[model samples]
Target: THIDLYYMLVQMTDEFYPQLSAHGKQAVIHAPEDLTVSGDPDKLARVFNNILKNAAAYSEDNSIIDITAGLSGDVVSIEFKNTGSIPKDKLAAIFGLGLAIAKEIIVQHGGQIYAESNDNYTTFRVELPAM
Candidate 1:
């Protein structure tokens, strides 16, 4: 179904917010709304959930997981950004089923999922074809 991805992201963020304290972290969602995408919400929710969970796990205490969902042209990009890297060998390989599953679901929707990490931060960017 074609639906607003940002709206779903906000819902997912809220659902995962309580877990932040459990992991000793903080979060901030920058999803501006109304960006549409065609895909299974359940699958996408898993993608978002996995990314958020990983972000919290890797983040240091009191760090912020900044989630930003936005649109560019006909593509909607939502980034789950945090501190620390995924791992040198696993950067492009996207190791583990958590990230691998998210990658597969995004590709099935004619989108792309990538992780970009630098000295300052690690960001998981999911780009989907906007409706």
Candidate 2:
């Protein structure tokens, strides 16, 4: 089972600078890699769509979005890493039911979802058991 994660990494530009929160101006998506994992394509697509869009809402223009993919160990990882440091304490709770609901469509096909954020970087990772 392989999944495809589509994402857009945006960079804050001067034009939209004012729109960004203080934390967003200095942000930059590290790689902008899209497509990662193995599973239901439609559900996986929605998963990345929601997260990437959420990232854009919080970003400014001139932001670079990395869209790429890779396989690791036993799990295929789809990652959306953007600039700015999220409050470390809120790391695990960042994606609650609301966030999940959008991508939950993937779960219907029996897949897993996960996300994490660190200093100057936020990543969304998901893995589906090998088919």
Candidate 3:
């Protein structure tokens, strides 16, 4: 199915908001408004939902989960950035089980998924073929 990535993100934010708020966190989706991609929407939703849970788990209270997306050439990139960093020991398998499944689903859709981090923030980036 053809999915509107930005719309899905907004829906994801709303779905995760209460839990995030209960934990003293905020989530924002700042991305291109009308980008579309072709894939299994349910699995893609799972991927983002899992990532959102991780973002909330690792982030500090009162911090924001920043989601941003962009498109360059034929690829659409969506990034989930939060206030956290990965430990060197856990960096090898940063995604863990839930994210492991997310990565596999993205791979099946001919996309790429990875994480980047520094001292203060971790960003999970997903790149898909833009439609």
Candidate 4:
């Protein structure tokens, strides 16, 4: 079925907000008013939830984790950004666990997912076919 990515993002964010708030972290979504993608809701939620959990885990206290999305070609470019840095050597393995699962799910759905980090921040970007 066609899933509303924006709705999922909000749901996941709300579901995870308490835990994040406990750690003094904040989450923000900057996607369009209405945005969607074609994919399984279970897989999509798992993928999105995994990323959100990781973002909260890696972000510093009192920091903000930003979720933004926009259209690029026929794809929806979604980004989860936080103030955290993975070591240069560890960047390649950032997606080896839950993120690995997310990568597989996204790829199998004809989407793309990757993470980028530096001294100051890390951004997890997902590209899915817009519906």
**Best-first order by TM-score:** 4, 3, 1, 2
Clashes of each: 0, 24, 0, 0
Please provide, for model 3 over 3-121, each residue's C-alpha lDDT reduced to its tens digit, 9 standing for 90 to 100: 98889999999998888999789999887787788899999999988888778878888999999888899998888899987675665666543578888899998999988778799
Model 1: weakest 10-residue lDDT segment is: 89-98
> Candidate 4: worst 10 consecutive residues by lDDT?
89-98
* Global lDDT of model 4: 0.86
Error of 4 at 72 (Å): 2.2
lDDT of 1 by residue, 49-75 (tens): 888877877677778899888888988
Candidate 2, residue 119: the lDDT equals 64
What TM-score, computed on C-alpha atoms, does each candidate reach? 0.86, 0.54, 0.92, 0.92
True-vs-predicted CA distance for residue 91, candidate 4, Å: 2.3
After superposition, the stretches of candidate 1 with alpha carbons farther than 4 Å from their true spots are 95-97
**Which residue runs does candidate 4 get wrong by more than 4 Å?**
none
lDDT for model 1: 0.80
Which has the better TM-score: candidate 2, or candidate 3? 3
Give each model's whole-structure lDDT: 0.80, 0.50, 0.86, 0.86
